[PDB]
Amino acid sequence: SAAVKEFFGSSQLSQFMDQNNPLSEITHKRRISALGPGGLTRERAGFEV
Amino acid sequence: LVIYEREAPEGTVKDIKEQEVYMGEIPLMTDNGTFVINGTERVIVSQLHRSPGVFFDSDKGKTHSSGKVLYNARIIPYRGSWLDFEFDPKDNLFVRIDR
DNA sequence: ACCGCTGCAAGGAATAGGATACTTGCGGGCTATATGGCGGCGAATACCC
RNA sequence: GGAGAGGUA
DNA sequence: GGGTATTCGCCGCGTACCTCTCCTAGCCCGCAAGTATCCTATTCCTTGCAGCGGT
């Protein structure tokens, strides 16, 4: 329970859903992030990426 | 749970017992595609991470100041310890494990 | 002035009913193993004289 | 008070 | 020893503001609640001893 709940509730890829439109929801559910566990850090990523 | 018999050869059953053990609570997904965690429905975005396999990468001559490239080959598993092979400027061959 | 009698307790078979020892899940109270960043630079070895 | 995420110039 | 090359490890990477969420893990011991059990009565029967009229 801890191992799943901690991921779902507080991770870098389970984020609060801005909901001030239909469009915001649709375009937020299709997002394709590159950060998170196993990805590349925000502030030390080169330019070629 | 299954219990063998010690004196009997490997493979035998003295008695076997089972029951329906509870474990965990997996959140479910609403119809739209948004989970509800604590009255604060959230969404999980997809990730774009580099795939497991093998990559023969190289550095574009940014070491040794000699203009000599240095090819390297990495094996990236899905879960475990990585593996790297590299070429020293002296044309050696060096393994490297988990950096 | 002796005795067999009646009668009055002590221990067996059938039902209802509370007390009370026993069992259990908790709630708060406490203690104690990573792998996508370069660049500069200076110190610390390596090296082959 | 500290972390994580998103946003504006 | 000594001049030199190569490697290792430390230091550094913009300002101001707004919104949201979440903040240690595990054992343990008292303790409330709920229960199965044990002792408590009633009705029938057949004994064993002490009074007791009677002569």
Q: How far is A20 from chain B (nearest CA, A)?
A: 14
Three-class secondary structure of residue A25 per DSSP: helix
Instruction: Verify whether the Cβ–Cβ distance B46 to A17 is below 8 Å.
Output: no
Resolution in Å equals 3.5
The residue of A6, A33, A47, A48 whose CB has the most chain B CBs within 10 angstroms, and thus the best one to mutate to test that interface, is A33
CA–CA gap between residue B32 and residue B99 (Å, rounded): 43
The residue of B43, B51, B58 whose CB has the most chain A CBs within 10 angstroms, and thus the best one to mutate to test that interface, is B43
Q: Residue B24 class from Cβ within 10 Å (0-12 exposed, 13-18 middle, 19+ buried)?
A: exposed
Q: What angle do CA B23, B27, B31 make, to 5 degrees?
A: 145
Chain A residues inside the 8 Å CB shell of B45: 13, 15, 28-29, 31-33
Is the distance from CB of B96 to CB of B84 less than 8 angstroms? yes
Q: Give residues 8-27 of chain A lying near strand D (Cβ < 7 A).
A: 12, 15-16, 18
CB of A36 lies under 7 Å from some atom of strand C: no
Q: Show Cβ contacts of residue B44 under 8 Å, excluding neighbours closer than 6 positions.
A: A8, A13, A14, A15, B35
Instruction: Verify whether the Cβ–Cβ distance A15 to B45 is below 8 Å.
Output: yes
Task: Return the number of other C-beta atoms located less than 10 Å from residue A25's C-beta.
Answer: 17
Is the distance from CB of B36 to CB of B51 less than 8 angstroms? no
DSSP secondary structure code for residue B54 in this structure: E
- Way it was determined: cryo-EM
